[PDB]
């Protein structure tokens, strides 16, 4: 039980925050989160022939399963907020000066690099 769910959660986490191109529209990611929750919900309750199923306390295995669910559920909302931020460029208002200032200093620690086409736009 513990290993397959941990592997699936890590795989879903990797899938949530990975994109093929920086300058491209991203996918919904909602279906991936629902499928991951459906797969994890299948495993916990269909092997439940041996689970405690008690209401007196929360066992150690129960605490482990809830935490994986929340970070998957929180992860699907965090992935949706990236699309909302990216789509803000269709309005035509450039980001604030302080917003761009903070962005350029976190990137070296984040280990991300500016694309070539973005450098060419600044030069032009």
């Amino acid at each position: 039980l513990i290993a397959p769910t941990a592997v699936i959660t890590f795989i879903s986490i990797i899938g949530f925050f990975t994109s093929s191109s920086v300058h491209d529209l991203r996918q919904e990611k909602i279906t991936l989160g629902i499928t991951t929750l459906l797969s994890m919900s299948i495993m916990i309750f269909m092997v439940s022939d041996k689970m405690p199923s008690t209401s007196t306390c929360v066992p150690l295995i129960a605490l482990f399963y809830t935490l994986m669910i929340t970070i998957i559920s929180v992860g699907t909302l965090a992935a949706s907020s990236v699309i909302f931020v990216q789509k803000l460029g269709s309005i035509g208002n450039p980001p604030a000066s302080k917003t761009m200032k903070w962005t350029h200093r976190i990137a070296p620690f984040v280990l991300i690099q500016m694309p070539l086409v973005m450098k060419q736009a600044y030069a032009k």
Partner: peptide, 19 residues
Amino acid sequence: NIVELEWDWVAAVLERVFL
């Protein structure tokens, strides 16, 4: 568009922070 490119990179940096 330069405006679209600037917001594209903000989301890219934010995405890696979440990862």
